[PDB]
Amino acid sequence: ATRFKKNRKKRGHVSAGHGRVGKHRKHPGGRGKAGGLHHMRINFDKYHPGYFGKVGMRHLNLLKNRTYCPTINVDKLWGLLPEEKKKEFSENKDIAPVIDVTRKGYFKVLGNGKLKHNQPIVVKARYFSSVAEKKIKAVGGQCILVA
Amino acid sequence: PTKIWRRWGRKVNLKEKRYAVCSSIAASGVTSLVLARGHRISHLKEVPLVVS
Amino acid sequence: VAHNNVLPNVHLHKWWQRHVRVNFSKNIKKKKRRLLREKRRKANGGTPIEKLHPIVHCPTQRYNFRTRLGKGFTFEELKGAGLTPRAAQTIGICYDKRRKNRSEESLTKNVERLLKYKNSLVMIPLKKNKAKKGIGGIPADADKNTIKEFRNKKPLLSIFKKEKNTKPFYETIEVSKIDKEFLAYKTLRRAKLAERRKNRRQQKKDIKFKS
Amino acid sequence: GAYKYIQEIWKKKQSDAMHFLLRVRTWEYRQLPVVHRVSKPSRPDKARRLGYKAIQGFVIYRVRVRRGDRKKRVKKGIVHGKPKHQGVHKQKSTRNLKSVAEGKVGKSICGNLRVLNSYWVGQDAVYKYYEVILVDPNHNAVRNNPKINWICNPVHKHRELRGLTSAGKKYRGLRVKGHLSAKSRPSIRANWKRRQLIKLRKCR
Amino acid sequence: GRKSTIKPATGIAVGFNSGHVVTKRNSKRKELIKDVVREITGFSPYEKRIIELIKIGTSASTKRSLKYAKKKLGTHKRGKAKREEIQKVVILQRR
RNA sequence: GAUGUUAGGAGGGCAAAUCCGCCGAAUUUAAGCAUAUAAUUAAGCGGAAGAAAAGAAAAUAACUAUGAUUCCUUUAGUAACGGCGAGUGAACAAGGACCAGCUCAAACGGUUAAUCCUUCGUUUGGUGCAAACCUUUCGACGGAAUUGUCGUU
RNA sequence: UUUUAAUUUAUUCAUUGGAAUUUUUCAUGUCGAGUCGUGUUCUUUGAGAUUGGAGCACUAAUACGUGUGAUACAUUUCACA
RNA sequence: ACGGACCAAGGAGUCUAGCAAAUGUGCAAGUGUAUAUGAUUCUUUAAACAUUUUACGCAUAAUUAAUG
């Protein structure tokens, strides 16, 4: 990989592509994020707007396991289960699938997307969106709370 | 100075490795490719040759 | 800094070349550990080097649904299996004094696991054809013929592994059994709203029961 | 059952009797040399509650130690550095006076012995007194005992100098567990080394 | 949140006693030593101060005794416990 | 307590890559610099092993709960700290390697220290050509120990 | 050559103790003090009305106790140790 | 204006971490089998091969100091 490097093609060019006037010096602007708010301020404000300052209150120790909550929208509930069983459930109107999304790894069911019309489906989840539940029972299904 | 923490090895995707092995077997299965690689096979009966 | 890059964050402001280390011997160590465990399972002469561990439930709401291997069966589980901790630790059963069985489900599941292990056990006499019926819950000692005929049969190492769970993430119910009046979102919201006063009621119940 | 009464008595230290005995014995210890052997424990219940036993190879030394902080070892107050490091008076030692006391006797005065523990004995304005239990690792009465003979192995030499006695465990942060210690457990320096040891796999 | 040791958990994940629905399952020598040590030691000087403050027997005196015990021992809990114990001994010696 | 060229013993010094205590900077970065950073680093003093150190909860969690320590993957450049600037920065859960638990103190034992050590002897046998080594329990003596050894849990 | 598994064989006679669990009672025992803790000072930490350590001052309770539950308090539940 | 008396040999944009863009490649709402395990593989081989039907990262959903 070292023979594909751009410095190789400037082998006999004196300045190595770094300029004859400005030269390549050692940290001519500072080190790291040195000049923020002083002479790199234009860069900071143009590319990282809200960088300086603090907002909000502290959460002293977090324990992300408490609030871990993967989500799934209602438009993927039918795609969760295999194609042949999807065909069977759609064909037979006397029975409906009850899907435990927690086993697949989802805690909350969100309401984005379109469910199939007149296809009942029961969903078991730890949390439900209001619109998700509305669509579930609009297509004739039911939401079941589990823990 | 050369250091021991150079990137000596590479991580290759398992799917790409399996693809490469399958392609190598397929290439070994065609007579012209073996001859091109340099094996003197002008006298064998067939290039996917198998024996008892 | 320049252009539209992420702001640098590299924590390399100390003497890090002294702390760099690269594992050239990962697979060599793999081989060494494999060789060591093969050597000790040859040394102990038939008895597996693995020890039985209980099936426990992972803590926190993240891993609530998942089970794994805990360390040590509880005193209650060992008693349900009919053996003392001191005797159990001599036949490859791990025991810990810290865990407690808050649920009958865990108690019975680990007890049945212990019973299955006990039934799978075949005991080699301590004194070379001086078979005895054992103490502390240790099973009665097997005799010469069964020991000979079972020594040349593959050991059941699947019992030591954590059990696979049946996955009924799919199932079917009859449409007429669908409750069309339930309101899951409203139930969740109401439970959250009422949590504070019910904790108050529970505290008052505890104070009353304290007398 | 006498040890329980002795312990309850020593639990007071402000009663008339305890005050009087503390006064007279601290006066005697002041006149005695800085490190001196005692024939038998002056607090038999406390020594016994520590590791002490009445076997032959067990001895006890009383040690005097000076109180307060030691001041920075810079010649006059002429530290040549940033103002953050210019303080010389309020420098508190990492080791406690108890650990310093056991070191005073374990370093070279009786280097043939092993320091087990130490206890209180007395106080004063300028001195803290301590009694240190030491074990002879070469006495057969200690060696043949299935207990206590762990100290004969040459991995317990100068525990007081490696911070392995109870005072050492205290000043190393090993008397607390969990989130209150966190980064002290395998030793502070070992934990620090582990926490920035950068590991690179061969194949990345 | 708070649970209930009886009345099994509701099957939902929020609120009071939420969670899965698993099946739940549930002075003859000290005081003699105390009297002996009390007889041969007595009370500390700060204990004596608290004793006389309690003996004064006014509301301001009891508040002062609580403040003094808290200052002497550290922590409101230890100060309060010491005050209660001293009041008990004051009553027991008043009888 | 002293004192003993009394009998038998121990410590001292070297060596350090890994390891355990202490002590302890500044260069540097902040485009200046003083807090900060460098760094709980370098230098200095002391102490061990083939590993050391840590270690059997005055621990987590808040769950359907886990169960000594150490290390790896990850948590996570995250919670957090910070002229909130430059910079710094863990823990729990999860997956693995390995896997091991214990005893003093305190309790109880006084129709009986039931303990320990020193020295001198006796034999029960074994491998060695030898040199030497492993096993042996009957003691006797002199002491230590009730200001507490040992047994039980 | 080293050790270390499986495989060979043990049979009579005897009294000397010890251990696990299970029956029926007595009795709810012990549990580490100038220590913990608190205040203050310095240092250390990501630890923030202080993470640990140390110096100094004060100085506990007795398992119904006392320590932890990452914001300083008072009254108090709960969990864990 | 500074360097160069002469000749030979040596002599300077590299390595690692992290981010992005570009392009090539594989798979695709999934992707990467991490550490580790197994296996008549064990000169090569410290590499190749493999992974009893929710480990983890990134992505699959955003927004808010925040209860959410």
Largest CA distance in chain D: 75
Indicate yes or no: CB of D5 within 8 angstroms of CB of E36. Answer: yes
The conformation of residue C111, written as its DSSP 8-state character, comes to: H
- Unique residue bearing structure tokens 């392609």: B23
Chain B nearest C-alpha distance from D174 (Å) = 36
Assess C58–E contact: CB distance below 8 Å, yes or no: no
CA of A102: nearest nucleotide by C1' is H54
Q: Strand H closer than 7 Å to the CB of C170?
A: no
Experimental approach: cryo-EM
Chain B nearest C-alpha distance from D76 (Å) = 46
Minimal-distance CA residue of chain C relative to E16: C195
Strand (E) or helix (H) holding C67: strand C67-69
**Alpha-carbon dihedral angle through residues E44, E46, E52, E54, given to the nearest 10 degrees:** -110
CA of E2: nearest nucleotide by C1' is G78
Crossing angle between the packed helical segments D16-31 and E30-41, to the nearest 10 degrees: 70
Count of CB pairs separated by less than 8 Å, C with E: 47
Minimal-distance CA residue of chain C relative to B5: C22
Chains in touch with D (3+ beta-carbon pairs under 8 Å) read B, C, E
Indicate yes or no: CB of E33 within 8 angstroms of CB of D18. Answer: no
Query: Is the Cβ–Cβ distance between E90 and E57 less than 8 Å?
Result: no
Assess B4–C contact: CB distance below 8 Å, yes or no: yes
- CA–CA dist C127, E7 (Å, integer): 55
CA of E76 to C1' of G74 (A): 9
Rg, chain B, Cα only: 18
Beta bridge partners of A144: A124
Crossing angle between the packed helical segments E45-56 and E76-94, to the nearest 10 degrees: 70
Strand H bases with any atom < 7 A from protein Cβ: 13-20, 25-27, 30-39, 46-50, 52-56, 60-61, 65-68
Of A144, B39, E46, B51, residue with least CA distance to C187: A144
Query: Is the Cβ–Cβ distance between C156 and C49 less than 8 Å?
Result: no
Indicate yes or no: CB of C169 within 8 angstroms of CB of A93. Answer: no
CA of B15: nearest nucleotide by C1' is H26
The full 3-state SS of chain D, as one line of letters, equals CHHHHHHHHHCCCCCHHHHHHHHHHHHHHHHCCCEEEECCCCCHHHHHHCCCCCCCCEEEEEEEEECCCCCCCCCCCCCCCCHHHCCCCCCCCCCCHHHHHHHHHHCCCCCCCEEEEEEEEEECCCEEEEEEEEECCCCHHHHCCCCCHHHHCCCCCCHHHHCCCHHHHHHCCCCCCHHHCCCCCCCHHHHHHHHHCEEEECCC
Cβ neighbors of B42 (< 8 A, separation 6 or more) are: B35
Minimal Cβ distance to C20: which of D193, D198, D201: D198
- CA–CA dist D39, A23 (Å, integer): 81
> According to the annotation, is D89 in a ligand binding site?
no
Chain B residues within an 8 Å CB radius of D202: 8-9
- Unique residue bearing structure tokens 């309690």: E54
Amino acid code (one letter) for D55: I
Beta bridge partners of A72: A109
Q: Strand H closer than 7 Å to the CB of A55?
A: yes
CA of E3: nearest nucleotide by C1' is G78
Overall resolution, Å: 2.3
Indicate yes or no: CB of C191 within 8 angstroms of CB of E15. Answer: yes
Cβ neighbors of C151 (< 8 A, separation 6 or more) are: C46
Cβ neighbors of E23 (< 8 A, separation 6 or more) are: C103, C104, C105, E8
Indicate yes or no: CB of C1 within 8 angstroms of CB of A128. Answer: no
Chain C residues within an 8 Å CB radius of A130: 185
